Amino acid sequence: KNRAARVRVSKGDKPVTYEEAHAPHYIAHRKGWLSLHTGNLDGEDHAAERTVEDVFLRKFMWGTFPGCLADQLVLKRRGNQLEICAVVLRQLSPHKYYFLVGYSETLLSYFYKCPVRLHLQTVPSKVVYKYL
Amino acid sequence: ATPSLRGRLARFGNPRKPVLKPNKPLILANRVGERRREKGEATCITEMSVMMACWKQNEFRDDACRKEIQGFLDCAARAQEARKMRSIQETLGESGSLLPNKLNKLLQRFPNKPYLS
Amino acid sequence: SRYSPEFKDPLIDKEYYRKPVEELTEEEKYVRELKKTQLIKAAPAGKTSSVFEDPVISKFTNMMMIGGNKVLARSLMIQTLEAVKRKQFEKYHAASAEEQATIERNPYTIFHQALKNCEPMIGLVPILKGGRFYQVPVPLPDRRRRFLAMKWMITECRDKKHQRTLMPEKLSHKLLEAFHNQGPVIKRKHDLHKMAEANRALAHYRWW
Amino acid sequence: ETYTEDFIKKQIEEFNIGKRHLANMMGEDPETFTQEDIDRAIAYLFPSGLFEKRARPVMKHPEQIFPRQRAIQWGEDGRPFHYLFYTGKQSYYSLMHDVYGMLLNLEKHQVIGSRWLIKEELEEMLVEKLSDLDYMQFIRLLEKLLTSQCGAAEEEFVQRFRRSVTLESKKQLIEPVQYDEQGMAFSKSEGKRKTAKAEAIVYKHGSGRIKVNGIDYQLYFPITQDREQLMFPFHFVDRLGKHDVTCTVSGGGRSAQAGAIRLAMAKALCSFVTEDEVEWMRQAGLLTTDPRVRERKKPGQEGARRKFTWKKR
RNA sequence: AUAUACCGCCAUCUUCAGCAAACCCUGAUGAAGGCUACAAAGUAAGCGCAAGUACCCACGUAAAGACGUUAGGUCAAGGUGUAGCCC
RNA sequence: GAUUAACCCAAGUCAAUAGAAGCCGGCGUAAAGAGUGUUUUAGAUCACCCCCUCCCCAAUAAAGCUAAAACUCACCUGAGUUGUAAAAAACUCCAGUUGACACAAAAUAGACUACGAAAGUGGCUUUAACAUAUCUGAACACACAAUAGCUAAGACCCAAACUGGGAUUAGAUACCCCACUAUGCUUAGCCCUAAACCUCAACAGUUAAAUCAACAAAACUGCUCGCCAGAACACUACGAGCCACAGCUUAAAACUCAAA
Ligand SMILES: [K+]
Ligand SMILES: [K+]
Ligand SMILES: [K+]
Ligand SMILES: [K+]
Ligand SMILES: [K+]
Ligand SMILES: [K+]
Ligand SMILES: [K+]
Ligand SMILES: [K+]
Ligand SMILES: [Mg+2]
Ligand SMILES: [Mg+2]
Ligand SMILES: [Mg+2]
Ligand SMILES: [Mg+2]
Ligand SMILES: [Mg+2]
Ligand SMILES: [Mg+2]
Ligand SMILES: [Mg+2]
Ligand SMILES: [Mg+2]
Ligand SMILES: [Mg+2]
Ligand SMILES: [Mg+2]
Ligand SMILES: [Mg+2]
Ligand SMILES: [Mg+2]
Ligand SMILES: [Mg+2]
Ligand SMILES: [Mg+2]
Ligand SMILES: [Mg+2]
Ligand SMILES: [Mg+2]
Ligand SMILES: [Mg+2]
Ligand SMILES: [Mg+2]
Ligand SMILES: [Mg+2]
Ligand SMILES: [Mg+2]
Ligand SMILES: [Mg+2]
Ligand SMILES: [Mg+2]
Ligand SMILES: [Mg+2]
Ligand SMILES: [Mg+2]
Ligand SMILES: [Mg+2]
């Protein structure tokens, strides 16, 4: 039986998001990609470097906004601009979200030597697609 | 007339020894048995045994045994088609008294009641 | 199959189509109006409307084909038909005016009659009974009789007993032998008949 | 996820305001903005390449989006509105009752283009869930109604449960007859066999010359079977030696190229034969593109179908 | 060291169509069982199949394939519980 | 096991042993209706009232008889017959037709359900003949009791333990094939055993209430006799009785187990 990236059926009490509810074979069919860049196009270079950067930013944001992320990050690269789009919860005070945005954008801009912007969308609670 | 069942079974009140010892309760089921496929046998051997007789006398030369060979060939063809015919008529029930499937739907509507309601 | 079940096989027969309407029956009229609504498979690249088309020779050719090499299989067939015709013209010119009438020079007539002389009328099937397998004489359908005649002819020509003889010379010689009720393929038929005869007492073991 | 009437009413108010916003975004008249324009604007503004269209961005009217919900089936006093409520299938059995009642009244008084609706379409007209045997029983009752001397009132009713099906004609299309600089009538068609692609120009009048990539057909096709394929279309309609052909073929092997040319010539030849002859070519397999193409190899097996040897145990 | 503590990714039946929450009913309120369409106690969310999608079609081939089975495979992908080594 | 804490009782605590604490329940399948019938002394209330299946069907004993099928002999024909999943061994004074011809066994009837205490009894005839004008009742008696077996004298078609041969098998002391004996039959005496089970005691009565663990052949009342009380040891040991001498009946204990 296939296991990869499959949230398994339970008793009907486990809330899953839309991202979680779709196995890998639905990628490009029902669900899109969580990062968009040119490295994996034919004739393009530096796919390995974009992949390492993406893995770091996901770990970095998980621990920089601990308990606040309500879904996976969406990573967008245009030119040398890096856009991080995150769906977060509404528990932390707005002052802390502004501190962490200023801190994260600045720290990541100096780390990867590119202008980095963080876009936060807040939701009252994790959006539930279905109960498995 | 159905044979009698009075005094046939070992029961309280029945002085005599039992006449019948049914291993299953004598109670009508709500289903009949399934049409039992009949045992098949080798066919056309009579025609097969006339062909193989001429061969023995004609050193297995088909030119001398044409009429007998054509008989056996036709007989096998008829038995091949006959099985195809029977099979169709067996499922349709063209000759059957009734189909176990049809005869069981009828018993479902009038089930035997060995209990009180 | 890449054809859905809805696709019907193509009917390649010029005569079937030119037949006048009046000659048609009410059943044949329905089939013709029906096919106009049906899907038709593409015609395979083998059979055509040619008047020189022979389904038996095309089938014998495919049973000679090794590894999809139809060109070679077809080449051998036409070389056998040419070798048969040349051997008959040589027997014809060397014969007397009386014998000439009985000498067949058409290789298609020889090919067809040679196979019909090798078709076995009875067959043998193995049947498990009482812990020993028994050979049992059984009638054979016409399809199976024709196939066995071809398979025995090709098998005989592929036998290693023939040393350095090319297939068109081997097959042509075997066809002319069978055309005259001689040769090893006719003997193979007679043996199957003798084995089926000797196993006559075991015919009852068949249940169909 | 039940949806109340107040919820749908709010969703329609949002769609009408958003419909005017979307028209304002694209600089189009909000009054003449149709649903086809909405779909076009949403596809541009929110481009999605997801293979399943149902997963793509959509801005539809609430009636199209949300499922049909049955309304409450009893009032404040708790009394159900319909006399067949307690069956659990009031809509289905009310229909059976109405059809059964019509069959009775008839007694007291006395195909190609249409089909019966499927169970999933009946289950929407009724807004109930149905078994398969329920569907059959209802259809058996409608068929029993056609066999009777049904009048006009009994015919509008049966047509509600009949869905028009668009039969597609199998009649072969005919290419236009074109004329060259010299005024010679000709037709042009194309054919595909495996990876071979052919384009054939069949002239109305000729002597039987066939040019394949500028070469005589017998020089281009030295294999006699490839030439029989070229003969097949013309021979079948009794037109050997009556047309000139100039065709070009690329891709595939020698046999696939002969098949692609055969199909291209047959399609182009249909312009110069009678309609009855075109139907005979169709029924002879001369106008059908062969869909038989090489199957991919699968991983873990030797070929497209052949498996690796099952190792001796 | 332990895959007989596990996550992860899988084999296998599966070239299957079943799994099942919550209720209801039958059996004197036992382990258990629950269907007959001219119908007789079952209603069933959800999961799988199916449907959709990919490839050249509506075909085919891929993909998919639940719950479980074999303490099946892997502590040597990586991570890791327990135990152990630390000149 | 140590240690910490806790619990119980407490000038006691509680290890071993012993005693106290048991018959109105059951007997189709869990142990149990003893193979069958019949007394006395007794017991019961089912005996008077008050009533409806007498005779015939396959009880039993004796004598006589024989239709079908065998065996044997004879004449005439045939070269094989037998054996089967398939073979071998076996017979070849063998086989087939016809005729003559049982101390053996008893198609059909019988889809009947009768007789007898049970065991048993289903070809024909004849003779004799099937207890009890309350019920229960003998394991302290009496008379019976399938098959097998024993003793003695006969009969002998067929079947058939054992034994021999053939085949199978790793082996085959079996299953399969052939041959043949004890034995199955009769007479006269023994033996006294069966899943002798319809595992359901006799007699009288009831169908309503609670119908009723399950299954089996619905649930019960009155009365009486017989029998039963965890498994195994044990259809055993010992004692006793017996025409029984490798037998039958009656029938335990020790050790062992937490089940059966
Ligand atoms: K694992
Ligand atoms: K590991
Ligand atoms: K570890
Ligand atoms: K003390
Ligand atoms: K006994
Ligand atoms: K009888
Ligand atoms: K008799
Ligand atoms: K019994
Ligand atoms: Mg797999
Ligand atoms: Mg009584
Ligand atoms: Mg029984
Ligand atoms: Mg291959
Ligand atoms: Mg494991
Ligand atoms: Mg598909
Ligand atoms: Mg697959
Ligand atoms: Mg699927
Ligand atoms: Mg293991
Ligand atoms: Mg007992
Ligand atoms: Mg008794
Ligand atoms: Mg007694
Ligand atoms: Mg008495
Ligand atoms: Mg005795
Ligand atoms: Mg005796
Ligand atoms: Mg004997
Ligand atoms: Mg004797
Ligand atoms: Mg006698
Ligand atoms: Mg008895
Ligand atoms: Mg007893
Ligand atoms: Mg008594
Ligand atoms: Mg005991
Ligand atoms: Mg004993
Ligand atoms: Mg004893
Ligand atoms: Mg003693």
Side-chain angles (χ1 to χ4, degrees), chain D residues 276-313:
Chain D
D276 300 334
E277 285 177 294
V278 175
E279 181 56 41
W280 302 340
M281 296 160 72
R282 201 191 67 86
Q283 293 182 25
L286 287 169
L287 301 171
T288 299
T289 310
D290 204 314
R292 297 184 295 155
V293 296
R294 179 185 179 270
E295 194 177 292
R296 63 160 288 192
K297 182 195 169 300
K298 264 66 65 167
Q301 50 185 77
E302 186 280 337
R305 302 294 181 83
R306 175 168 240 291
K307 308 297 183 297
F308 293 124
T309 300
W310 190 30
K311 294 190 183 74
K312 170 168 155 176
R313 301 147 300 282

Side-chain angles (χ1 to χ4, degrees), chain C residues 2-3 10-12 14 17-18 35-45 47-50 70-71, chain D residues 170 223 225 228-229 231-232 235-238 254 262 279-280 282-285 288 290-293:
Chain C
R2 303 308 304 273
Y3 290 108
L11 178 52
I12 302 152
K14 296 174 62 168
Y17 297 104
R18 314 306 177 81
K35 290 204 75 191
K36 299 188 183 180
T37 63
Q38 292 177 331
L39 294 166
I40 308 293
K41 297 184 187 183
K47 197 206 189 202
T48 62
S49 54
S50 185
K70 191 82 77 77
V71 169
Chain D
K170 304 310 191 191
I223 303 306
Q225 179 181 77
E228 292 171 349
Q229 297 316 297
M231 195 179 69
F232 189 10
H235 186 260
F236 181 83
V237 294
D238 295 315
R254 53 153 202 86
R262 190 190 81 183
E279 181 56 41
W280 302 340
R282 201 191 67 86
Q283 293 182 25
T288 299
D290 204 314
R292 297 184 295 155
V293 296

Side-chain angles (χ1 to χ4, degrees), chain B residues 32-92:
Chain B
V32 291
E34 297 161 310
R35 184 166 297 274
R36 292 174 210 187
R37 80 194 289 168
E38 295 177 351
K39 174 62 189 164
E41 305 179 317
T43 175
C44 67
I45 283 165
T46 310
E47 289 69 52
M48 189 195 274
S49 299
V50 168
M51 183 176 62
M52 298 193 289
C54 296
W55 283 345
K56 259 289 174 188
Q57 295 173 25
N58 302 344
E59 297 184 9
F60 293 82
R61 298 184 294 92
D62 291 3
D63 59 2
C65 319
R66 286 294 181 193
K67 303 194 175 189
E68 293 80 24
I69 289 165
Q70 191 67 94
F72 165 87
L73 288 178
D74 302 340
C75 188
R78 289 158 193 173
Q80 188 182 3
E81 296 147 40
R83 296 295 300 277
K84 195 179 81 185
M85 288 300 187
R86 180 197 199 175
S87 65
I88 297 156
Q89 294 168 36
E90 275 182 331
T91 60
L92 291 169

Side-chain angles (χ1 to χ4, degrees), chain D residues 108-126:
Chain D
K108 301 182 179 193
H109 180 101
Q110 295 145 52
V111 169
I112 294 165
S114 51
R115 59 169 178 81
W116 289 122
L117 82 180
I118 60 172
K119 188 180 96 185
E120 286 72 15
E121 294 179 80
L122 189 61
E123 280 178 305
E124 294 295 288
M125 281 176 84
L126 296 179

Side-chain angles (χ1 to χ4, degrees), chain D residues 177-219:
Chain D
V177 175
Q178 308 183 36
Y179 298 85
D180 64 13
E181 295 177 351
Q182 295 179 336
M184 302 305 168
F186 72 89
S187 61
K188 179 180 285 172
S189 181
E190 284 182 345
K192 293 179 180 179
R193 183 72 164 91
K194 296 197 184 170
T195 63
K197 302 173 187 188
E199 189 175 17
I201 297 170
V202 180
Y203 286 89
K204 184 176 187 170
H205 295 299
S207 304
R209 308 194 314 279
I210 304 177
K211 292 262 164 171
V212 191
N213 296 332
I215 307 301
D216 288 343
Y217 68 99
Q218 84 286 1
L219 299 172

Side-chain angles (χ1 to χ4, degrees), chain D residues 117-159:
Chain D
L117 82 180
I118 60 172
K119 188 180 96 185
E120 286 72 15
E121 294 179 80
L122 189 61
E123 280 178 305
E124 294 295 288
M125 281 176 84
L126 296 179
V127 192
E128 292 180 350
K129 158 174 162 176
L130 290 176
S131 179
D132 288 320
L133 291 171
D134 284 327
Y135 174 78
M136 302 181 201
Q137 299 265 351
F138 175 63
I139 297 301
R140 284 173 63 255
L141 208 60
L142 289 175
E143 299 179 293
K144 185 177 186 284
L145 186 60
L146 294 174
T147 61
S148 63
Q149 197 193 319
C150 64
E154 295 82 357
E155 280 165 28
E156 288 190 356
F157 185 88
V158 180
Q159 288 294 346

Side-chain angles (χ1 to χ4, degrees), chain A residues 1 26-27 48-49 52 58 61 73 81 83 92 98 119 128:
Chain A
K1 293 187 292 188
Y26 293 119
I27 294 162
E49 295 79 321
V52 165
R58 292 180 192 281
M61 288 288 291
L73 298 178
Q81 299 172 71
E83 282 194 333
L92 274 192
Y98 273 93
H119 298 276
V128 175

Side-chain angles (χ1 to χ4, degrees), chain A residues 22 32 53 121:
Chain A
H22 285 90
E53 297 164 5
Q121 185 192 141

